[PDB]
A paper describes a structure:
The posttranslational modification of a conserved serine residue in carrier proteins with a phosphopantetheinyl moiety transferred from coenzyme A through the enzyme phosphopantetheinyl transferase (PPT) is vital to all living organisms. Molecular cloning and biochemical characterization of human PPT revealed that this cytosolic enzyme is a Mg2+-requiring monomeric enzyme that exhibits a broad acceptor substrate specificity. Whereas microbial genomes contain more than one PPT, only one PPT has been identified in mammals. This enzyme exhibits a broad substrate specificity and is able to phosphopantetheinylate the ACP components of the cytosolic and the mitochondrial FAS systems, as well as aminoadipate semialdehyde dehydrogenase, the human ortholog to the yeast lys5 gene. Human phosphopantetheinyl transferase exhibits an α/β fold and 2-fold pseudosymmetry similar to the Sfp phosphopantetheinyl transferase from Bacillus subtilis.
CoA is bound in a bent conformation with the pyrophosphate group at the apex of the bend, and clear density is observed for all parts of the molecule including the phosphopantheteinyl moiety. The 3-phospho-adenosine portion of CoA is tightly bound through a combination of hydrophobic and hydrogen-bonding interactions contributed by residues Lys89, Lys91, Asn108, Arg47, and Arg86. The latter two basic residues play a key role by forming salt bridges to the oxygen atoms of the 3′-phosphate of the adenine ribose. In addition, the Nɛ2 nitrogen of the imidazole side chain of His111 binds to the 3′-phosphate group. The α-phosphate group of the pyrophosphate moiety is held in place by interactions with the main-chain amide of His111 and the side-chain hydroxyl of Ser110, while the phosphopantheteinyl group is bound through interactions with side and main chains of residues Glu181, Gly190, Leu191, and Leu195. Magnesium is coordinated by the α and β groups of the CoA pyrophosphate, the carboxylates of Asp129 and Glu181, and one water molecule. A sixth ligand for the Mg is not present in the final crystallographic model; however, there is some residual density that implies this position may be occupied by a poorly ordered water molecule. The metal cation is found in a solvent inaccessible area, shielded by protein and CoA moieties. As found in many other Mg binding proteins, PPT has, besides the inner coordination sphere of the ligands described above, a hydrophobic outer shell that is provided by residues Ile130, Met131, Tyr174, and Trp177, thus creating an environment of high hydrophobic contrast. In the PPT-CoA complex, the long C-terminal coil of the enzyme (residues 290–305) is highly ordered due to its participation in crystal packing with two other subunits in the crystal lattice.
Numbering used by the authors: 18 to 107, 110 to 257, 274 to 315
The structure:
Amino acid sequence: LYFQGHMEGVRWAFSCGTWLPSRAEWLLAVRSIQPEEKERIGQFVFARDAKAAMAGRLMIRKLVAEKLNIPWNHIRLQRTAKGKPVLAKDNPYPNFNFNISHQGDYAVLAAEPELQVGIDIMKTSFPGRGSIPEFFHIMKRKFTNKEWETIRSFKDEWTQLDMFYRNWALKESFIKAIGVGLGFELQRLEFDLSPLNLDIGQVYKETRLFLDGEEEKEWAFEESKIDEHHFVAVALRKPTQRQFTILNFNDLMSSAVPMTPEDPSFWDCFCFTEEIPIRN
Ligand SMILES: CC(C)(COP(=O)(O)OP(=O)(O)OC[C@H]1O[C@@H](n2cnc3c(N)ncnc32)[C@H](O)[C@@H]1OP(=O)(O)O)[C@@H](O)C(=O)NCCC(=O)NCCS
Ligand SMILES: [Cl-]
Ligand SMILES: [Mg+2]
């Protein structure tokens, strides 16, 4: 009917872990977000967390600005009672919605014009305390009997770890899609992971979810490895390229404009993990 573009699904990542902005670039970014979000970021103790959260905000603003054609300074983002970022009530889309996650060295965003969307990123890391088996026993309540049988079916304990983190990202993607936050009973959610082995450079779409013991055929999941050690899961509730495009700071700043005045307190106020021994 109209001479107009139609939004497709968006899959974007940003390497916040290797982002090293100058001071002017950091402070410009701080100016380009909402005041209450800026306040929230100014209270993180560590730089890597401030950087991750900043990246998430800028990705969400670039999304709305460029896919909904709303001036950056006119984007009004809100949060549900359970913390979930949402776009304030009226674009022309049936169910425009978006979700981010930030873990290890990356921020990731998924968005969709109609499908309800959730995302999680997890990095495989050896346990901070105790053996792998002790970790699995501490974490027992998060996964069902059948999910544990799959996780523990590999001979290699590290492969079991990968599989643990993959199943975690999958469940958290579902939970984030529906916005319930904390307290969802994880025993209710049973994923049947397929295929068993994932390589870099493909999106995989065969995993299925059973909720309260019945297959939820209206939900689909996309799984990929952004690198050898980071797993991403997108959950979607009812010509497609679904690989994540990795953006840089310049791309985050493409439609950005300052919204608050420059704030020098936001420079030189964070700790860095390089200053301490990583333990736990
Ligand atoms: C926020 C939550 C969903 C996950 O926290 P997390 O893993 O530390 O955070 P992630 O980086 O993956 O995602 C955080 C982002 O989600 C968004 N978010 C916040 N609340 C949300 C909610 N209730 N629903 C969906 N997204 C939400 C925010 O944009 C947040 O980024 P920000 O803090 O920079 O604003 C938290 O509610 C939670 O841990 N509950 C689920 C626990 C769970 O069941 N885990 C799976 C175990 S197998
Ligand atoms: Cl913001
Ligand atoms: Mg998470």
